Amino acid sequence: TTLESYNKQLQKGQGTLIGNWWEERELRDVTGIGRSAHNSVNDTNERTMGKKFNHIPNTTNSEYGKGFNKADQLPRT
């Protein structure tokens, strides 16, 4: 365990390119607080979960009644 170490508080930039640099890079792009915001409160939801694709799908039980076949509405003769 020799993480941290050769990289102090710096905003933006390619960093120090030592150890595990890539993983934390995106976060600072995602929002503030590169790691363990000093004691700019860090929202715990931001780190653990990941990208958000926000939508609530239909019940999928209410999928029976809804169904249409346009080819049944032609005037015919």
């Binding site: 019940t59 209410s62 999928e63 029976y64 009644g65 169904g67």
Partner: protein, 434 residues
């Protein structure tokens, strides 16, 4: 002046009934609201009762011990049709324990259910019989449904009862204690129901895939096939035809013996929206597709047993002879053998109303089809597997402590295996040749 009463219980029962009533309502021109504009034969008395002006109501009885699924019927796409008080709902779930659903919580809904059923029967005038869908590999259906069947029998007697049960499969199932739930339900049903149909889950998947080229189906798709089978079974009673079939003509035609009355069904042809119009779908080939081993809806190999009685109901514009030609073809085919004491073992009805397809369905429009609901001694295997599982898992009192606490006796389990063994022995003996 003929009608039927439908009994729906359990989660799977409710979902299957949803599709069945969808097909029924679409087949008669009654929109979801309950109004039927048409634009008039009394073809709608079989399942629906006129409300006085326009709107109708289905003779449905719904029961479940949990509010989750009952509510959705009251908040979905059919909220203005069903009777406001005929959707009986519980307060707590059974939790997949047979004891819970048969002696303490299941005894405080029987009174209400009997009241509703009595009102339905009184309003009905020519009640032909009962149609029951229930699941056994679960909590609510096995116990509540069995007790309801017991009470219905003790109340009415000679009225016939038909059961489209939902049993477990060989390898694909949800419950880890499902076997125990099955045996008690079977012990209850064997001596009080008349005709039952095995409709396991696994078999439906295979047909769905291998025909409709849908490798990722869902329960909803499986529901539609069962709904279609039910509709084809019950159509003859209400639609005009030349060779009609009355549900009364299954007890006296498709149950050789009072005890051995278990039979497995199938449905076809099932062709998608692409492979539909480039084939022949003629009467001759469709019959041969009905008897193929893999097509049947129950995971029961037919080739491993004799046939004892089979009934077929054609629909559409079939001509009678082609029914005869197919019958002769299957009879002559050596691959299929018939029991030594059933010389004439087919009973065919021909109807006229063509098959109808629900919107957006996987089934493309067709003009002929056969709904084989035959019975065969091959069903022995399914009871063998459940009995073997029961023995293996009851050898050393696993999960037992749950049951004894709810009221069930320890010695009850002894009876169930006894009856199952007796039934297995009866099946083995009956098929022997003279």
């Amino acid at each position: 002046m003929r009608e039927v009463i439908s009994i729906h219980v359990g989660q799977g029962g409710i979902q299957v009934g949803n599709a069945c009533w969808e097909l029924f309502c679409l087949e008669h021109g009654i929109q979801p609201d309950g109004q039927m504009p048409s634009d008039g034969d009394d073809a709608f008395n079989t399942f629906f009762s006129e409300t006085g002006a326009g709107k109708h109501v289905p003779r449905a009885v719904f029961l479940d011990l949990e509010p989750t699924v009952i509510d959705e019927v009251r908040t979905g796409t059919y909220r203005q049709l069903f009777h406001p008080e005929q959707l009986i709902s519980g307060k707590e779930d059974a939790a997949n324990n047979f004891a819970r659903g048969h002696y303490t919580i299941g005894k405080e809904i029987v009174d209400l259910c009997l009241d509703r059923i009595r009102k339905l029967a009184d309003n009905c005038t020519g009640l032909q019989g009962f149609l029951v869908f229930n699941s056994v590999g679960g909590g609510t259906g096995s116990g509540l449904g069995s007790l309801l069947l017991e009470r219905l029998s003790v109340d009415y007697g000679k009225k016939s009862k038909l059961g489209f049960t939902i049993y477990p499969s060989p390898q694909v199932s949800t419950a880890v204690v499902e076997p125990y739930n099955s045996i008690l339900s079977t012990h209850s049903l064997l001596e009080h129901t008349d005709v039952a149909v095995m409709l396991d889950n696994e078999a439906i998947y295979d047909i769905c895939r291998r025909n409709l080229d849908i490798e990722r189906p869902t329960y909803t798709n499986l529901n539609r096939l069962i709904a279609q089978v039910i509709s084809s079974l019950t159509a003859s009673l209400r639609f005009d035809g030349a060779l009609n079939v009355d549900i009364t003509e299954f007890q006296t035609n498709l149950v050789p013996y009072p005890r051995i009355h278990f039979m497995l069904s199938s449905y076809a042809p099932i062709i998608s929206a692409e492979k539909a119009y480039h084939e022949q779908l003629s009467v001759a080939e469709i019959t041969n597709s009905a008897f193929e081993p893999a097509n049947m809806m129950a995971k029961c190999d037919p080739r491993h047993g004799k046939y004892m009685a089979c009934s077929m109901m054609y629909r559409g514009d079939v001509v009678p002879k082609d029914v005869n030609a197919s019958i002769a073809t299957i009879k002559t085919k050596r691959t299929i053998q018939f029991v030594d004491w059933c010389p004439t073992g087919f009973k065919v009805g021909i109807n006229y109303q063509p098959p109808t397809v629900v919107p957006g369905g996987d089934l493309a429009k067709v003009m002929r089809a056969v709904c084989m609901i035959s019975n065969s001694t091959a069903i022995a295997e399914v009871f063998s597997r459940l009995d073997h599982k029961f023995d293996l898992m009851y050898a050393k009192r696993a999960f037992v402590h749950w049951y004894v606490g709810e009221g069930m006796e320890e010695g009850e389990f002894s009876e169930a295996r006894e009856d199952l063994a007796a039934l297995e022995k009866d099946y083995e003996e009956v098929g022997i040749e003279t």
